[PDB]
């Protein structure tokens, strides 16, 4: 049911346009219609959590878009591209990812992902 967390719990909220749930390895668990992240690109994100030295300076890519590091801790890596961007949140077993555009506010996006992450962590994922 990882597809429902995406269709309903993420994209369904309206706060995010595209979304996915990656494994700590980079391999996609579930994803939305027009979004895909390469294994290399996902394992690259899964690591910026151990040290964002690299993304902090070069930035990071997701599905062909080069994002700029805004925030980047050991649980949350945020990026932006003009007035759109992506929220990525690490759980105990996964990594949530939701992208937003100009019609959506960064905190609105950020809030939905953040909260869902809490819920899954509470569940053991």
Report on the structure:
The chain has 125 residues and is α+β, with helices and mostly antiparallel strands. It has a single domain (1-125), classed as Dynein light chain 2a, cytoplasmic (Beta-Lactamase), CATH 3.30.450.30. The chain is built from four helices and seven strands; from the N terminus they run αββααβββββα. The chain has helices at 2-10, 39-48, 53-58, 106-123, and strands spanning 18-23, 28-31, 60-62, 65-72, 76-81, 84-90, 94-100. It has a seven-stranded antiparallel β-sheet, with helices on both faces. The longest helix is centred in the C-terminal third of the chain and has 18 residues, at 106-123. It starts with a helix and ends with a helix.
Q: Can you write the helix and strand succession as a string? A: HEEHHEEEEEH
The helix tally amounts to: 4
Number of E-state strands: 7
Count of domain modules = 1
Distance between the termini: 13 Å
CATH level-3 fold name? Beta-Lactamase
Strand content: 25-35%
Main β-sheet, in a few words? 7 strands, antiparallel
- What is the correct CATH architecture? 2-Layer Sandwich
The helical percent reads: 25-40%
Report the C-alpha radius of gyration, rounded.
Answer: 13 Å
Look at the structure and name the CATH superfamily.
Dynein light chain 2a, cytoplasmic
Structural class: alpha+beta
Shape: globular
Largest sheet: spatial strand order: 2-1-7-6-5-4-3
Q: What is the class in the CATH system?
A: Alpha Beta
PDB class: contractile protein
Keywords: protein binding, profilin, actin-binding protein, contractile protein
Assembly: monomeric
Entry title: acanthamoeba castellanii profilin II
């Amino acid at each position: 049911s990882w597809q429902t967390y995406v269709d309903t719990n993420l994209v369904g909220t309206g706060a995010v346009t595209q979304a996915a749930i990656i494994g700590h390895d980079g391999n996609t668990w579930a994803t939305s219609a027009g979004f895909a992240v390469s294994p290399a690109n996902g394992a690259a994100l899964a690591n910026a959590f151990k040290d964002a030295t690299a993304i902090r300076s070069n930035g990071f890519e997701l599905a062909g878009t080069r994002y700029v590091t805004i925030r980047a801790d050991d649980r949350s890596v945020y990026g932006k591209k003009g007035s759109a961007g992506v929220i990525t949140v690490k759980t105990s077993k996964a990594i949530l990812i939701g992208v937003y555009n100009e019609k959506i506010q960064p905190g609105t996006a950020a809030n939905v992902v953040e909260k869902l992450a809490d819920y899954l962590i509470g569940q053991g994922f």
